[PDB]
Amino acid sequence: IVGGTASVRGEWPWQVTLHTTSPTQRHLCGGSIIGNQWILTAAHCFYGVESPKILRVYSGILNQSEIKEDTSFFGVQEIIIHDQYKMAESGYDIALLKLETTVGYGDSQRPICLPSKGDRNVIYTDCWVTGWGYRKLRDKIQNTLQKAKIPLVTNEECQKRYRGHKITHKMICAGYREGGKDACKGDSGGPLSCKHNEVWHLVGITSWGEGCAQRERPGVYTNVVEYVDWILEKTQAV
Numbered sequence: 001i002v003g004g005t006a007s008v009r010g011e012w013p014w015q016v017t018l019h020t021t022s023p024t025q026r027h028l029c030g031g032s033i034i035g036n037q038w039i040l041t042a043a044h045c046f047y048g049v050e051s052p053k054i055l056r057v058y059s060g061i062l063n064q065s066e067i068k069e070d071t072s073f074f075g076v077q078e079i080i081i082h083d084q085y086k087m088a089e090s091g092y093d094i095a096l097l098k099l100e101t102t103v104g105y106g107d108s109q110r111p112i113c114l115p116s117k118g119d120r121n122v123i124y125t126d127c128w129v130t131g132w133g134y135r136k137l138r139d140k141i142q143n144t145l146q147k148a149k150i151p152l153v154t155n156e157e158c159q160k161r162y163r164g165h166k167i168t169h170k171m172i173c174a175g176y177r178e179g180g181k182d183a184c185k186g187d188s189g190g191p192l193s194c195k196h197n198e199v200w201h202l203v204g205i206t207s208w209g210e211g212c213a214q215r216e217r218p219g220v221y222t223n224v225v226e227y228v229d230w231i232l233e234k235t236q237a238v
């Protein structure tokens with residue numbers, strides 16, 4: 001996160017750190033708890049990932065330093081990538097992780113509500129992007145979970161900012177015209193959480209952008225409301 005601040009413990013209890021153990025254990029992507037066996041993240045995170053056996057999900061983490069060999073985690077039973085997904089810039093940048101065991105809910109880990117079908121017409125004015133990603137273009141993964149409030153941008157306005165790309169309604173953008181606050185390297189897969197009627201909703205999935213927090217370059221997010229049926233299809237399968 002560029003231009004953000006340290007989060008308070010328990011502030012984003014749906015935020016997870018997805019680690020890889022191949023070749024060395026390290027943070028790979030952000031993610032969100034949406035169910036007691038389900039993590040919602042970005043499909044691009046799994047480029048070259050041949051097995052879910054190399055993945056570890058850590059919930060209830062403020063600081064990456066809390067993760068040691070003895071730290072409990074959730075194994076991944078299955079990686080579910082949207083089957084229309086080709087690349088982040090083309091959309092369908094969404095994936096589900098089916099966990100091997102059940103997340104016990106508490107004040108350190110709980111699910112975030114998915115947007116409602118009716119909420120496609122609602123205007124969110126209180127949106128936050130969270131993660132352990134870089135604070136600048138050339139940096140390292142941050143110890144403490146960072147947060148930054150970002151305004152949503154219309155599709156039309158986002159499309160003017162990305163000449164040469166096709167910004168679909170399955171994408172949602174967020175950023176300041178002058179830049180300064182955004183997601184950066186290591187934040188992808190994480191949430192864009194918006195508070196409306198005292199309830200947090202998973203409005204976006206950190207997907208892609210041209211650089212980090214650049215002037216007239218909004219962050220591009222998977223528009224979660226456009227995938228609620230896909231999420232229900234994969235999580236509510238008979």
Ligand SMILES: NCc1ccc(Cl)cc1CNC(=O)N[C@@H](Cc1ccccc1)c1nc(-c2ccc3c(N)n[nH]c3c2)c(Cl)[nH]1
Pocket residue numbers: 026027028029044045046047133140141182183184185186187188189206207208209210211212213218219220221
């Ligand atoms: N252009 C930035 C931008 C701006 C606004 C918005 Cl909304 C989205 C984005 C996108 N921001 C991303 O996170 N992009 C992902 C893409 C990607 C995901 C997974 C694997 C490969 C590529 C990314 N993650 C890392 C990364 C991961 C882990 C570590 C680590 N342990 N050390 N260093 C790291 C660095 C890099 Cl580099 N790039």
